[PDB]
Design a protein around this ligand. Structure first.
Ligand SMILES: Cc1c(C(=O)C2=C(O)CCCC2=O)ccc2c1C(=O)N(Cc1ccc(C#N)cc1)CC(=O)N2C
Ligand SMILES: Cc1c(C(=O)C2=C(O)CCCC2=O)ccc2c1C(=O)N(Cc1ccc(C#N)cc1)CC(=O)N2C
Ligand SMILES: [Co+2]
Ligand SMILES: [Co+2]
Lengths: 378, 377
């Protein structure tokens, strides 16, 4: 932890999906994850350009944007636009979606100064995507390129999401909550890790944090509350690499998965599993019971025997660090393309609680293989 | 006067196809918001490299949701070797349709007894073809002519869902059911009614069935079970027509609303309004109480005092025919644009029921302003 950040970062701010129709994705995600409609920006708020809806659960902010017809905004140019998020662009958005499907366009981090952060990033090698723009003399926004067509976004405050969003009338946004509270890491899939790590730790000063189809490294902020792992494929293997399958169906580099921190992963999983076949997110097939017998041998000090039996009801995977213990599970893909998916996380130990306590689960690749071959022979 | 002039044999509505950016998310939203089962699929998991297509069903109502993959996936596929289950599909036409109109209905699909002859007769009677007949396996034939806008009227026929779909695996298949049972009418908006009603009646032989800013007429098959109303705008000088607003945000003509018949509209509305703000569909703001104080005067012989009470709690609208009575309600738009919406209906009268029983609600245009004036006082 050299604390080598070239500017000051203070946690994730929001994840932005670009969609064909934003109403329907946001309503599916709302119900599937227990997130509340909190802010809107569309025709009803005087936006002729895009429709945008903010979901929030705790500190997690999911935003969903689709474009209107360009005719609607035909008498506007870029400085005269009615758009509340002025880095938007019809042709980029339709291009992004036609190429990659539904997915993440913007990983947005809060920084002390966005203007600064943009200047310091390009001067250390970052490809600019959107210059610094300020909203109603309060919030500043900027975009540099991250990987694929996914930008890293800088929100800064001078002195209720962004200006020109309206707070959502509480008679249409029902208090939903299944326990999700934070974005914990955002991960990207790429063809060559070396080049992507070199470029991205270059313009941020993020440090590196402490096969079965992939190689992976994590980039971290000074306090290690922003975590950005990146994977590449390992080819020729017995099975074909899931990383490789992503890149094919995504047409290149992109955001693989988002990991959401739960203040009670068992509450979250129950609520989510309850709604899988009625509009929410399905889950990966749960591991065999041999994986859970082996659990007492590796985490029996951390989890009681009943809690282990409740992991097994829910299909939870468990891995352990030098510092803490990780509880994790993975959804099936969120969209039509086998590309992006969600992972639900609770961390245990390392006490605020440090970021990364428990790792990221890599030990669970090997573990499963073993547990599935022990099961298939008895 | 039902002149029974169908230029070919027509059974009932078969399904509706939406074209979307992401099939998965639309279908799960609609399933939950409407009470429809996940019952069939065609996608990568079943060998379709071209499009994803998911099918929700409630009774005889079938909603299909379809989106395109990256073309890279099927680049060495020609039409004879296609893994597409719906051969009229076309990456360009979908992506084009969707950026011009957003989320919307591409295919109103009626089931015929022979689709090759339905297509031929239609095209021999003014129908502009969109897809000439393709034979799937050797069980089902499909053909598409132009309807209005980029919406096609699709002909399905059977010798005895579609080949290449699989049944949904029970675990993923939740038997949801809020009471909806079939599609009752399908309505388009066009800028000129006259050309559109001539074109469509010309190649079908459908017959006519018999201001607030719109003009419309209704085409129907011989038994009047397929119903096709069409609205045009009445442009004037007092208010901007709502039909014109549709045309602008849709970028021209398309399908305005689907009318979904419930076997028990009170139950359906109950379950839909429970889910409105947790993933489902909102509804248009409800009429003023003066509208419901006036209900017993007009249908006090059809609905009990208790059942009028339940209309008002659910915000339902009532209209009366020369022959029957109609319960109806309208959602807000299904997607980002102020274009397509859904209407839930149930008809009472005309005893098997005969189609269009009770009309289509035109009485409620003046019934509503009449109540808006009274509520003020
Ligand atoms: C992605 C992932 C991570 C993960 O978090 C990640 C990082 O955070 C940085 C370190 C490197 C890395 O791998 C950790 C464990 C993991 C997966 C995983 O992916 N799958 C398969 C899997 C297939 C298909 C879908 C879908 N849809 C989801 C997961 C299977 C599995 O057994 N385990 C245990
Ligand atoms: C469309 C429609 C029909 C309808 O079904 C139809 C046919 O079946 C064929 C004959 C003519 C026709 O109009 C019947 C009644 C009706 C509407 C209607 O549309 N709206 C406004 C309305 C605005 C915005 C939205 C939205 N979003 C939905 C409805 C308002 C209203 O008071 N009433 C009473
Ligand atoms: Co992870
Ligand atoms: Co109607």
């Amino acid at each position: 932890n050299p604390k080598s950040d070239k500017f000051k970062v203070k946690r994730f701010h929001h994840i932005e999906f670009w969609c064909g129709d934003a109403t329907n994705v946001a309503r599916r995600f709302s119900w599937g994850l227990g997130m509340r409609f909190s802010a809107k920006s569309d025709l009803s708020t005087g936006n002729m350009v895009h429709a945008s809806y903010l979901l929030t659960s705790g500190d997690l902010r999911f935003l969903f944007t689709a474009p209107y017809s360009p005719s609607l905004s035909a008498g506007e140019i870029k400085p005269t636009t009615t758009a509340s998020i002025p880095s938007f662009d019809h042709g980029s958005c339709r291009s992004f979606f036609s190429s990659h499907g539904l997915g993440v366009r913007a990983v947005a981090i809060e920084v002390e100064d966005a203007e600064s952060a943009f200047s310091i990033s390009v001067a250390n090698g970052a490809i600019p995507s959107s210059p610094p723009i300020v909203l109603n003399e309060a919030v500043t926004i900027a975009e540099v390129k991250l990987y694929g067509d996914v930008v890293l976004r800088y929100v800064s405050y001078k002195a209720e999401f962004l200006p020109g969003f309206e707070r959502v009338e509480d008679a249409s946004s029902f208090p939903l909550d299944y326990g999700i509270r934070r974005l914990d890491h955002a991960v990207g899939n790429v063809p060559e890790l070396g080049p992507a790590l070199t470029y991205v730790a270059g313009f941020t000063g993020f440090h590196q944090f402490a096969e079965s189809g992939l190689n992976s490294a994590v980039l971290a902020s000074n306090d290690e509350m922003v975590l950005l792992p990146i994977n590449e494929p390992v080819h020729g293997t017995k099975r074909k690499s899931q990383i490789q399958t992503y890149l094919e169906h995504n047409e290149g580099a992109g955001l693989q998965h988002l990991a959401l921190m739960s203040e009670d992963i068992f509450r979250t999983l129950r609520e989510m599993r309850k709604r899988s076949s009625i509009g929410g997110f399905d889950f990966m097939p749960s591991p065999p019971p041999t994986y859970y017998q082996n659990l007492k041998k590796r985490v029996g000090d951390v989890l009681s025997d009943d809690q282990i039996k409740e992991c097994e009801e829910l299909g939870i995977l468990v891995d352990r660090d030098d510092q803490g213990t990780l509880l994790q599970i993975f959804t099936k893909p969120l969209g039509d393309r086998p590309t992006i998916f969600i992972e639900i996380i609770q961390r245990v130990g390392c006490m605020y609680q440090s970021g990364g306590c428990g790792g990221f689960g890599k030990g669970n690749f090997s573990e499963l293989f073993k547990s599935i071959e022990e099961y298939e022979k008895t």
